Write a protein that binds this ligand. Structure first.
Ligand SMILES: CNC(=O)N1N=C(c2ccc(N)cc2)c2cc3c(cc2C[C@H]1C)OCO3
Lengths: 339, 85, 50, 94, 94
């Protein structure tokens, strides 16, 4: 950037978006930076707008192109265009490779119900050898159970034969499925929906300490979301983080025991960035979108609104979303999960 | 989707502002949950999750357990005719 | 259509699932999107286990 | 009592060849059964637009006239244009 | 001679337990060995020019300036466009 100047100093999604808007409108533009840095805030005492919203009402700016959330309080002062990118409160969790050694994974080939059902056939056949021929008969039936299944009676001959065919299918089934997970590992959790994330307390979850995300659950009158709010309100320690950079940094150092709820635009962007561990799971929780702002009664309000709808129909917006998210994405998980 | 008003209509902007109020108060998502999920005929077909099970099914192994006890019972039936002969 | 009954005066407002398009934005005034959607995939979930 | 445990003079080759026979059958049963468990372990088909476009067993189509079909027509994305060129030339009509 | 054929009441449970341990190892040998023969089976080997672009383990590039590099640039074909988008931003310089 030090060796550049003008508008070519910056790059990103909104940088390409500003060139397309000016191309269909036919004006020259200049890319400026907001002073205070924090946009869309109106003080409760002074009622003075700040950030980029205040620069349009106070005439210090003509138009604004940035990820600005469309709210009702901002619509009463400036003009908002139609949404150019939809998003919503999504779930961000670290991708569990698993990569899951242990003793619970040893009895994984057969199921929890077969390991505990084969023993019912063990003691069931060792007790038939008592009947076909106690401290020496169980001593013998176990010595007749190890070696497949002194049995001169025809009754005891077919007991060791069916037990031989019975243990054959179990050991063939043990080998067959034990090869099915050293070949393909899903593997395969954890549930992607949000209602499943609330019904358990093993893995914690929280949102930002102050913002639109926390207020969504506070006043929500839906049954699923209200139980999520009564949890985070009485969840110790503090499940809320100071900034968005601390919430993403808390999921990475939690061994898959903490989740973070945030917008899907930021969630989908982190998934395609190093160290390539976060993965958006399940659908979003609410419906919201960004937009472009113009002053009320300005000469560029309607002309820019009609231009964005022309961009979305010609597949230009989705081509831009696929540009700075997945094409130029540093995703190494798409190369580490298939190797 | 959206609501449409004629160009230069009086009730244009008031309705536009009234939609943003219903959305942030959650009235839109509540109404979406009403005629779709609540009054839906498949409200149970939206909670059960289908995932890739790791272990081996018990049903296939049952076919082996029903052929084993079927031999144990047939074995005890031949045990009685050999004790009398 | 419903957009017709607004430009031709036979009605005052149209409330329905009306897709926000550019060709319609040039003739009438659209509100903010009260419901987001997109093209998806419908498949009959198996129903394969036997 | 000689079958439950594998299989003199003449009777040696009887149980000798019988064991090799039932060796391959219990080897074929174990080898064949492992293949059908690994196939279903692969699946799928996974929820995505490309996995719908990567295969052609489970066909796919849209409405004949509407904004859905016009999407894939003028779309300049690699994954979607592949779906358009498929349905545009898919027979019978999807 | 009691170790080959699988495995007193004390020694009888030595016979039963020694088998279930060696039964899992031979299965863990058989099952795991099938995973390394199925692996290779998924070679390329030796693939097509398109599948060369679908993976990033083996890097690929052309000359820095010539008729070959310009081909991938203005190629509107989806396959060659995916190749060009990779080689253009692949670091280090391919
Ligand atoms: C490092 N090991 C490891 O990561 N796993 N263990 C193997 C496994 C392989 C052989 C044996 N004897 C036991 C476990 C396994 C067996 C299974 C299964 C999944 C696995 C994968 C993981 C749990 O699903 C069903 O069965």
């Amino acid at each position: 950037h030090e060796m550049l100047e003008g508008n070519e100093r910056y790059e990103g999604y909104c940088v390409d978006l500003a060139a397309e808007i000016a191309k269909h409108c036919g004006f020259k533009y200049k890319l400026t930076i907001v002073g205070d840095g924090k946009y869309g805030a109106r003080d409760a005492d002074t009622k003075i707008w700040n950030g980029m919203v205040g620069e349009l009402v106070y005439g210090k700016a003509d138009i604004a192109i940035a990820p600005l959330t469309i709210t009702l309080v901002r619509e009463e002062v400036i003009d908002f265009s139609k949404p150019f990118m939809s998003l919503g409160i999504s779930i961000m969790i670290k991708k569990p490779q698993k990569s899951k050694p242990g003793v619970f994974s040893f009895l994984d080939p057969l199921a929890y119900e077969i390991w505990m059902c084969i023993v019912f056939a063990y003691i069931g056949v060792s007790v038939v050898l008592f009947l076909v021929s106690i401290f020496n008969s169980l001593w013998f039936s176990l010595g007749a159970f190890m070696q497949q299944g002194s049995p001169r009676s025809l009754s005891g001959r077919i007991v060791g034969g069916v037990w031989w065919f019975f243990t054959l299918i179990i050991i063939s089934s043990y080998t067959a499925n034990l090869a099915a997970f050293l070949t393909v590992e899903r593997m395969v959790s954890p549930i992607e929906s949000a209602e499943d994330l609330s019904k358990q307390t093993e893995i914690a979850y929280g949102t930002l300490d102050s913002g639109s995300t926390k207020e969504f659950f506070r006043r929500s009158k839906i049954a699923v979301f209200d139980k999520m709010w009564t949890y985070m309100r009485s969840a110790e320690p503090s499940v809320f983080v100071r900034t968005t950079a601390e919430g993403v940094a808390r999921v990475r150092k939690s061994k898959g025991k903490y989740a973070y709820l945030l917008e899907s635009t930021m969630n989908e962007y982190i998934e395609q960035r190093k160290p390539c561990d976060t993965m958006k799971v399940g659908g979003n929780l609410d419906s919201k979108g960004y937009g472009i702002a113009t002053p009320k009664g300005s000469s560029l309000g309607t002309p820019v609104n009609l231009a964005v709808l022309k961009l979305s129909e010609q597949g230009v917006l989705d081509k831009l979303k696929n540009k700075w998210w997945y094409d130029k994405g540093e995703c190494g998980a798409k190369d580490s999960g298939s190797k | 989707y959206g609501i449409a008003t004629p160009k230069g209509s009086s009730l244009g902007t008031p309705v536009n502002l009234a939609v943003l109020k219903l959305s942030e108060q959650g009235v839109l998502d509540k109404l979406k949950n009403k005629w779709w999920y609540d009054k839906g005929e498949c409200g149970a077909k939206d909670s059960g999750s289908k995932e890739k099970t790791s272990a081996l099914s018990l049903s296939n192994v049952a076919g082996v357990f029903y052929i084993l006890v079927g031999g144990l019972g047939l074995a005890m039936l031949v045990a009685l005719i050999e004790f009398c002969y």
